[PDB]
Amino acid sequence: AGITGTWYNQLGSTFIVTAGADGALTGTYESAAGKAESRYVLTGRYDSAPATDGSGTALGWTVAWKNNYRNAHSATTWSGQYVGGAEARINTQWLLTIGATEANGWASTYVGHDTFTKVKP
Amino acid sequence: AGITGTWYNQLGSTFIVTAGADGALTGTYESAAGKAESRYVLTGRYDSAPATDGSGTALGWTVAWKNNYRNAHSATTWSGQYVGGAEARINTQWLLTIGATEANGWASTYVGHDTFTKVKP
Amino acid sequence: AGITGTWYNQLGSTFIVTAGADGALTGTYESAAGKAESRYVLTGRYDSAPATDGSGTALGWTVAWKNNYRNAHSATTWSGQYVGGAEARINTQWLLTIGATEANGWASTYVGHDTFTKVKP
Amino acid sequence: AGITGTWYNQLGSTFIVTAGADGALTGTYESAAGKAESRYVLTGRYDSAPATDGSGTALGWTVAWKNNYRNAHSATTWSGQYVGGAEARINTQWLLTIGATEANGWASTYVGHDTFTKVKP
Ligand SMILES: O=C(CCCC[C@@H]1SC[C@@H]2NC(=O)N[C@@H]21)NC1CCN(c2ccncc2)CC1
Ligand SMILES: O=C(CCCC[C@@H]1SC[C@@H]2NC(=O)N[C@@H]21)NC1CCN(c2ccncc2)CC1
Ligand SMILES: O=C(CCCC[C@@H]1SC[C@@H]2NC(=O)N[C@@H]21)NC1CCN(c2ccncc2)CC1
Ligand SMILES: O=C(CCCC[C@@H]1SC[C@@H]2NC(=O)N[C@@H]21)NC1CCN(c2ccncc2)CC1
């Protein structure tokens, strides 16, 4: 399965995840960047029976940036895939939406890309 | 608060969601487009304590496109926000990642936008 | 060809464009939103020999948000297609990048979607 | 200022650009991936008076994937910024829109990211 573990992206954020037999992803996310501190709940989904032709395993997950310590009124989803093997890796693109008035909605979404590996920064 | 229930986007897809007290989103997604049939599990997160300044409620969710009937080796995340009121809507952008070889990774992610309302278009 | 004309998006921004025989787009953009005033130079490209099977005409263009009156140190590209016929329309997605330090680069790009029609708001 | 010249991204594609005094980007793009062969015209814009606070220079450009050899009925825009220095780079995100019927419009746009450097990877 390969996905369960502790991953780090290029910003030094820490992605602690468990890939369940039902296709669920469950864990915590700690962002090294932004209006965020300590750990946040995450939940997502992954293809629990991927192709065997060398394709990666599609997955995605969501963090809402509220925990017991602060609330940044925003949420990020990551969409990507797990690529196993030599140096396993989760390649993602992400969308970060901030709570906004409908008038400011046009400016409410950031886009980016994160690459995760199991190598502690 | 007004999130739980059945929503429809401009493609006629059906988003059935429950917003739990812990910030969790759970439900089913039925896509009227693409390599999809019947319902798929979704899970996500939402800001359970949004701003009281008229801002929307930030949220997101993931569908992996595998159910008991078929497996499209892909996953979509929607990132967006709930805006309550007379014409309640959930405005989203989404990323759909397909399982891909490293060679084809550059072409592995689609982007789009879905507007969900309480009434079918 | 259909693209040459004055278009307006859902924000009330005004897109004045000329589609040239070489595949070039040339014109001005006036944004009804953001750190912008009056007109900005735009340049882009379009498929000058599109499919005849009912597909739209792929195109894109760029505005850097500097003119004689102000400079917002940012640029937007729109990628989309012209759909001719009953009510002609240009459907786009866009990416707005703000000048940033490499440390703040993660937060430097907004994503959105604009739909243009020739109907004055 | 340091923008003009030849750049390469992680796919081995070759970006040849001239930054003119009027904010214009002009050049050629040779893609090492996808339905592309040989050079394609590009045109774009860049901030010709960027911030003096260490921020990058915002920019963007478009390629329509038609040249004298072939027509892929599609176009890519790259939105990003030039960051000068010892390891100069142009960091971009991109949107690739394909010509599509209204029916298939939802699936008509790919998203990705390209990092351009002065040295081939
Ligand atoms: O910073 C966060 C939450 C932390 C996000 C961390 C991001 S997730 C993708 C990337 N990968 C990581 O590992 N980390 C980063 N939320 C802000 C966004 C900007 N905000 C506003 C408010 C008002 N106007 C404009 C902007 C306020 C809330
Ligand atoms: O169609 C789906 C899953 C259903 C997606 C429905 C999408 S979710 C965002 C939007 N909002 C909706 O309500 N519905 C649509 N997955 C395909 C994608 C394209 N695929 C390939 C494979 C190989 N090469 C190229 C493309 C194979 C798998
Ligand atoms: O607002 C503009 C330029 C006008 C953009 C208009 C946008 S183009 C897509 C959409 N379609 C339209 O028709 N109109 C809008 N640029 C800002 C962005 C936010 N900026 C910062 C600075 C520092 N930190 C965070 C954010 C400063 C520069
Ligand atoms: O491949 C290209 C044009 C070359 C794109 C190269 C891309 S630009 C961003 C990235 N950075 C690079 O340096 N190179 C790549 N266009 C295809 C796209 C997929 N197409 C369809 C058609 C019908 N159904 C589904 C898909 C047909 C046309």
Numbering used by the authors:
A (entry chain A), B (entry chain B), C (entry chain A), D (entry chain B): 15 to 135
Paper text:
We describe here the use of an artificial cofactor employing the well‐known biotin‐streptavidin system to catalyze a Baylis‐Hillman reaction. As protein host, we chose streptavidin, as it can be easily crystallized and thereby supports the design process. There are several examples using streptavidin as the host for these cofactors, since its natural ligand biotin binds strongly (K d∼10−15 M) and is easy to modify with catalysts at the carboxylic acid group. No enzyme is known to naturally catalyze the Baylis‐Hillman reaction, a very versatile and atom‐economic C−C bond forming reaction for the production of various functionalized compounds and intermediates of active pharmaceutical ingredients (APIs).
We chose a derivative of DMAP as the artificial cofactor due to its low steric demand, which will facilitate its inclusion into the protein scaffold. The location of the catalyst is in a shallow cavity at the surface of the protein. The system was evolved through repeated cycles of mutagenesis, activity tests, and structure determination. According to the presented structures and calculations the catalytically active site is too shallow to undergo interactions with 1.
